[model samples]
Target chain A: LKKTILCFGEALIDMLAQPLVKKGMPRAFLQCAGGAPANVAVAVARLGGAVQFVGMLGSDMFGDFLFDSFAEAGVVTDGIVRTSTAKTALAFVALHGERSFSFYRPPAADLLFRVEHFQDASFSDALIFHACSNSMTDADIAEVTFEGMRRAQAAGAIVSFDLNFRPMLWPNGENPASRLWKGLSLADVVKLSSEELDYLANTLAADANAVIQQLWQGRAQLLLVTDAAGPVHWYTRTAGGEVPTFGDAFVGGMLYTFAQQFDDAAALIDFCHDPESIVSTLRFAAAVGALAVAFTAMPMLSEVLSLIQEQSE
Target chain B: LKKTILCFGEALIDMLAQPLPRAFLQCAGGAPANVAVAVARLGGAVQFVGMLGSDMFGDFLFDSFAEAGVVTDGIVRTSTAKTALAFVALDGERSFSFYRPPAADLLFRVEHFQDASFSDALIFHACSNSMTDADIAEVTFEGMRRAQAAGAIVSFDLNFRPMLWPNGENPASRLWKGLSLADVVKLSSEELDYLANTLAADANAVIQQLWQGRAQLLLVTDAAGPVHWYTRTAGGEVPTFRVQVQDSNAAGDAFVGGMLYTFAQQFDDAAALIDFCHDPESIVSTLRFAAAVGALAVTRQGAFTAMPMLSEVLSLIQEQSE
Candidate 1:
């Protein structure tokens, strides 16, 4: 039986503007389902992994849309709660190419999640639990986010943290690095972008490896550092190498590959030394990552395996 | 003693992409900031309170505020967030797309407001956009209450933009709460219509409801149309100057500035502002001055850049009389 990959955090809508300037256009927007943890849940499920999601959503129209989208993607939403305290979050993205993003999440319902609401949730079957730094936006939500991670870890699940550092989410005068470092320390595995690493360098440590070691006193077994279209650096105690990326899809691909292997952190790191195992896994992940960027959606496993077949031949 | 006007809210950069193909022009804007710029340009002492990101755009806004002679000592800067940007799409009707939430403006906290922030002579103004978030709403209400307690004229503009409010909260309820806290209230004709439907009444019934609030002076405006001014004992309609409208970005803000500037010139005592609120001649002159400022504003494009100087406003009013 495959251990469940339980993803916890925000689930919201992404409202993308058509283009900056289009002739005879009525200023249209393309609304789609998004939210990093939510996307990861769907991506894992689409890859044929057993996945469940836990979060709170507003009892509004957009909330219904999010639930429907998750169900369509085959993600287990039995852990999801609908609340009337707040409305669903909406991120209005400008199609500005490279520098494009604007989020609308002040009264976002996902931030209203409480530990008390999840008392009956079963973390027992969870093999891995994933989350992002956005869960630290509000004080109330931060408490629940950490509490969920603790429970998942106590249940013998590997804690995965993604440093999705959104500087805009933190209020003025409050330190963002302090909140993020605390989250980074809590996880056994972590993923971050090159840009995010640069931001942490000022406060965490001048060297990336040193910062990783300090996060959990070298307790963390794996670190994935990504750039937009460069080699993704894989860091471990005994071995380290570059896997490269097609952006965030690379992270999703890596997580799914680990799920397929069904190995612990030490065994995974030991497997990394075998050139045959490393090359095959990297190539498969690269193919899937490329397709994710091209289609702007998680590519199916059968479709990705076909690309892996073609690449090998 | 003429009082200074303290304008508080988000001060952002407006990105104007007109004709759909032309390059975007970054204009310094934000309703309260525009009002401050208008008051400053018309020779009134004005101070602005808000947080700005430590970026190139923040530098531009700071320089713009300084050049307009508005006090900037109250402005806070943070390296954590980016400056706010409002993408303007001027098609058939004007629509604003805001890049807020994570923007620095929404980060303005109550701690930023101190007792010493307000001067002895002050007329404080705020808007409904600041009340969209629960935290910022507390700061906004506290600022207005502090100014009111210090005997400052609390002016409010119900600049209701439906897109600003979260889906679960009723926009009218939030606006009505802000209205009750204001001493002088300004609303667009559309807002009056919204208020009417929200209260299940017509314009007259809405006006009656507003009169029962703390607001002493109430002004209703329509774009390039006659402005309706009302007080407890008197009211009147003043025709606005007819002009070739290029942009109406700063018209409403200019009207608020004109009204506040006129009030600042006439009285130092807050009681005098309410006492003369029912004077027909006072209402007529204030409405005419405000209408003149708005008419001059529509003749130009962008916000702060379009505000008319005291002499320019006088010249337009003089020409209108002829």
Candidate 2:
């Protein structure tokens, strides 16, 4: 069976907002290849996923480098769009007194993706159209993204959404509780951090778990919350990317294995609800996580399998 | 002379302590093990003959050996003793595990040499660490004798640690015996006095009294000057490439490996290769080549882990010559 996973979201650059902005040799954190959704894109590509990264890149230098790197890692580039409309998006990670991303946009090409820019047939055989909350800054990009998720559902593909709580990306007065829950309603699978749940739950004025269950709108079959080191919720299974996007690699492991092994949502849900299968999948993600953190590098398929075997023995 | 180089010694593990109040990274170590790994990494046909404790640490060492293309056929595993470990402290100090009854590395004997064919051994290398006990010492001498009899050139490095010996069987350590068995010998200039109460100064003159049959080249290296290379007939100096040192734990073995590596490719006749050692140009370039290997070894951390590849050696040589 062929399973195609399309990760549609912002694939941008992150600069460490350090004192003096000293971009010296030590800042390998840039992940020149990371920016959550793209990390998921390659992580799935490296694993067994029949995946394509469906996102926008600027017509600038960083675009081809991402193309060069992702294609080298075996990602399908058929749905990627290049635009001279704006430069590639960037964020300066302020990991100091208060943690946040000070975004470099207005010229951000990822936020400029419009419905007309994304082709219709990109959804033809896609089994899953996955996206993250990072792309919902503007009305146009949000609709262009959901239009695909709506069609992906129209075309019978699972729509997966990751809930991100970047307050700086959205304007002050706009309500994420109202604005973001609609995206959750379109998703069949939803993932969020415990920290993310607190902020989103406060906006709804309800208990975190109860608010999350209430937000389950359209075809929501599974709701997964990975509490860093805590016991994960019943909703299911999950290397990791660095700090903010660590779960991106975890999500990649879960999605690729799910799309390959199960034929339908019912089958995937059955597998997750089973103790052994869920633990097995989580262990696989943990191996990817272990290697990524220790080496601060991408996990190879061989390296992952070897680590798994070593731990098994 | 022959197709392969055989490195016979301990292939053990080293653990580095990272203090933040602490963590550790396990590393590959042992002197002859460094030479073997260096030769293998440099595209030399090389094999390591040793015993490792049949444990997790042994598995780690075996994996590193196989990964670096070093031949593990001569390696044996035993459950009698545990694999040795050297814990390196934050102050750059290292504390080694004391040997109990028959440590795995010490159990390796002359009979184990039958595990692999050393018929193509162009150069045979061993060091002082191989003779930590009476039984291990006999195997060290026997293997050197067997290799010499089989037309292989012997190279020995005098890696002396006084306490490692019983202050050496009451003066005149067994290390000199290991040196006498070799056509090529490497040692620090300060280690010249093997005889008790002999003057430690005048290493070149001291070597004349210490010289025995089959000993063709003696290298006296001082942190104080260049390497002083001597033959029974003539002597010359070759300045080593100076580099920042990472303690240079395996520099002697690395240098020995480089010289043998140079000779292994230089001539097909084993007899002539020994003769070539005395040639002025051969002495200069080969020592420079060996010096290059040692210089590179000290630039990196860890013992067996820091050896350079052939391409890296060539690149450094090019930079030095330029």
Candidate 3:
């Protein structure tokens, strides 16, 4: 059965050079590939899920490479539109050393999309609508995404959010907190990196409790905070009027949560790190993040598969 | 014997990049160091005595490679002089390339000769003397004459002329006539490549004869031309006097000039090209190629000049000079 996973937002690839001084006098070599949403599309496809990435990429070499990487990974390439007059975004990782990075990138590609480029009726059938924080950088893409989310919700689909917080992309602080919170306000499900949850909750929260309360006010019914090594938080609204909460930490080098219902936290944590952990929903999200870093490359499917297998083992 | 061989023209070092690319990128290069130091570097113990621009690069170049094989390299430090530059365009098979001539350091102290006395001054020489315009050449020629009259024999390698030579002086004849007065004259063995060996030999002899008894020793060479020797006495200058032409160019041959006291055999003690990467042709062909390339440049149309291909000069030399 082909169940749709409509992941949207920045589907850009990156070109990173080998770390300097390691290669003897800075060889100036670079590698290009896809990232984020593009990473998920390939991850889903490799694991035999029907995932399609929706976004705008320029008609550039890297854009073509992303398209090709998705096609090669068996991901559905349905909603990709080649926008005119704008290059696909690129993020250059300047490694300060191992595991440290400074990122520099060009502007977002979907920002170049005119309103006419979208067919407003398109999101009606999305079983799960996924989006990211990239559209917050440009007003045009922000409008497109806001309109798309409304359409998806009207069509009885659940909306997912990744708070891919890029603080540097803020337009000189004209109005970013407002710009970003709009997207967070619309999500049925919301995912935040540990740092992003702290910052989004304004660092004034007493603890994770304060963070969840802050997100609940924004109407995020299913909220998750992934802190890599810290606890993953989940708060889902239930019709029985019980706002169930699940917390799990160190789920095989990742933090993970599902939509509120859980049988056993201990078994789930044990299964989380096991190499043969059955491919469950929580493991899917954890595997996605862990697989992302396994590859030093973009379009990180092999890396995701390798990580999933490693954690399963 | 610390004989000073003062080379009074452009004294520049070459910063050469590798492989023969289609078009050449210009870099700081000149022929005096290209040849004279080449001769010294090749065991000639020749000195490079010239004027140089007083810039940081000029200062750096002034003493950059002092501890090499050459013995008596000296420079007159002057402010605000242009450093001569050239691009090594094509370098395969035969070393052919283009040069940017008169790269600074052209201001010569030609009006006076105060420091022209040294006891072992065997030769006063210049590698590519074409940059020695009348103002500079007069001083260079005077330096040579003073060194010669002091029993240090005078020599000139007709590294022909640079592209910037004045219109009045045709490079071949004008330089050949003026420099004929030197006691020892050497042209690269590479000259024989394009010109007939006999024609090249006859050109040396005829030029030597034109100066009456001015030159006693003459040399014509190929990359490996047999080192030729000629003598001049009260009987007049000898003609086409062939000796074993070594691959030694005008620079290594400068040592032959320094060793020339109306003594010194053609097959003396010049270093052979065994492990040594530089042959006389490297210096000589570079010098010859620079000016020969400049001569072949057909003034092109439009706002900018299209580059002349490497074949243009070879074809012109092969066709016209025959």
Candidate 4:
């Protein structure tokens, strides 16, 4: 069955300016656009994945530009909602050559998306159902997304969830950890960075064991953990059933040692972040991401088809 | 009653960066603050008119400074508006600067006077009423003149509504004719220079003007204008208002506001500027002395209330001129 990838998250505008530099201090820098999920979509599209975006955008100039960006990135925008909720979110990414800091806008548009806006039809027949913790930041979003994911799972689509924990999005008394756990349980395929696993386990101590043990307990079909510059570990249970014991079978995970240079891995994130490169396809996706860093637009859009079309042999 | 002077207008934050030599372009500038700073330092206490929106950033920087000083007074704040801002860049001293399109200038706060009596006013000054991008000009332009006719010395500070002003610019015809009625007409030499539309080399030719009996007194300041005084009795106007020597501040038109104040204090014009333009000693001793005040002003930083007092001016003038 052809898989449909439906991605849900936030879209924001970045208004940037050069950092103020005084005469004798370190040199000043300029501003550029950046956001976590938006960047991930770009990464995925560059690697040639089929994806659709569902969210609300403001009716301002920034919103218009973001629409143009989405189209150019080749993401399906049929479900994109436009409203006058608030101006689009703006992130100021100030980089002074070697140093960087982002000044973010509060209560940005992504937070304005409501439960009534999401549709179950968008979740049907989706081979890969991807959602970041961004959509689950609000309790309403958490409920709506859980429904959406459950709908996808009931449709027999594989659900992939990125545990993109953004603490700033959650407010008083609403625990981000518990919400993260709820999202993880609904997910059939899960991906998390090394640090996220530590934060999830509530300690840096049980990084390795806690990640493997937790996913085993939650019954995730395929679990992916990315350790920057180190190995990526994956734990998978067969589609039909019971939890395979610890020694069942080693399914995924790659140690990106200097030895990985000889490995025929499709996505090599050994140099950058985002460990998704190691599992999907081959170095083809990483090549796309690399080309993205060199090009003007987001990584995914321009790289997708072109990477899929080219052959190494 | 002790006579007072109140110059009301825009004073927004100015962000200036030197793009070329000697030329200071506009990073951000507001007219209200310019006049407030101008009159307060020139020898008059003025209450600034207009307010900025809560979002207008400059007001936050200005209100704190204005509240802490004396030359400027009675600043009423309005939370409903934003402040006016003009982005300017200067090409050296004589070159031109440009402004960006789609600016939110003059869309700030404006508070009206409930019962401001002109009887106690020695002078009431205003400049570029139309610049505020609103009705403040239409509201105050006429009433101010009426106040002036009632015995107060009315000064029309016309910076000239630049043709390039952001919004669909208004006709200057009304502004020009309204100016002919003022007892005192203060403008920039560049304004006249541009209107003359002459060659760059023929700059000074634009300075000579015939005011008739209608436009009584006039003063032009800045780079190319006469640095001294031009007066008229029953006769007519002179060719130039000249001032010489080290400091141009004493000869400033801003100082003329002070000279007018000092003359009003004595109520005598004859001794006011004996050799008004020629001597560089009498009125100019005042001008250079004021520029020294200007220098003193720089050392302290900021403007308006930052101006030095008469005693401070006298003490410094005695030290430098002697």
Off by over 4 Å in 1: A1-275, A283-313, B1-3, B8-30, B49-61, B74-217, B231-233, B244-250, B263-286, B299-302, B310-322
lDDT of 3 by residue, B1-322 (tens): 5344444467553323234211112222344554444344334445666666654346535554364444433566664334443322232443432222334556766543445433445556654454346566566666766675666656567665344565455455446455555765665555423233333555545644534746654555443233444444222211111223322223343233223311211222212111111334332333343333323221321000112234653464456444
Ranking by lDDT: 1, 2, 4, 3
lDDT of each: 0.78, 0.71, 0.49, 0.49
RMSD of 3: 18.4
Summarize candidate 4's per-residue lDDT along B1-322 as a digit string, tens digits: 5356555555554323333212221222344454445445445555555444443244443543364332433445543233433323333442222221112234323334434545455556666644434355554565466555655665666666453344456535445544654566655666656545632434334333325423455555564233433445322211222223332322233344454445345433322232343333444444454345444443432333334566766666677654
The window of 10 residues in a row where model 3 chain A has the poorest summed lDDT is A239-248
Q: In candidate 2 chain A, what residue range of length 10 has the lowest lDDT sum?
A: A237-246
The CAPRI quality class of candidate 3 comes to incorrect
Q: Chain B, model 2, TM-score against the native?
A: 0.90
* DockQ, every prediction: 0.05, 0.01, 0.01, 0.05
* Regions of candidate 4 where Cα sits further than 4 Å from its true position: A1-313, B17-29, B38-44, B56-58, B61-81, B90-111, B117-120, B129-134, B161-171, B195-214, B222-228, B234-312
Worst 10 residues of 4 chain A by lDDT: A244-253
> Over the stretch A1-313, how does candidate 1's per-residue lDDT look in tens digits?
1378888999987766555354322244556788888888888777777788889888865688799888988899889999876667867555424555655566578998889777434577777788998888877888788888888777777788888888776665788777787777778778889888777776855876567667646336667787766777766656677863334566566667666775544455565456556656765766664443333444456666676689789
lDDT of 1 by residue, B75-124 (tens): 99986566776767654766555556667888899889756666554688
Best-performing candidate as measured by TM-score: 1
TM-score per prediction, in order, is: 0.60, 0.49, 0.42, 0.46
Best of the two (1, 3) by lDDT:
1
Instruction: Give stretches of model 2 more than 4 Å off.
Output: A1-313, B90-102, B166-171, B193-205
User: How far out, in Å, is residue A85 in model 1?
Assistant: 5.6
Off by over 4 Å in 3: A20-26, A96-108, A120-122, A203-211, A238-313, B1-322
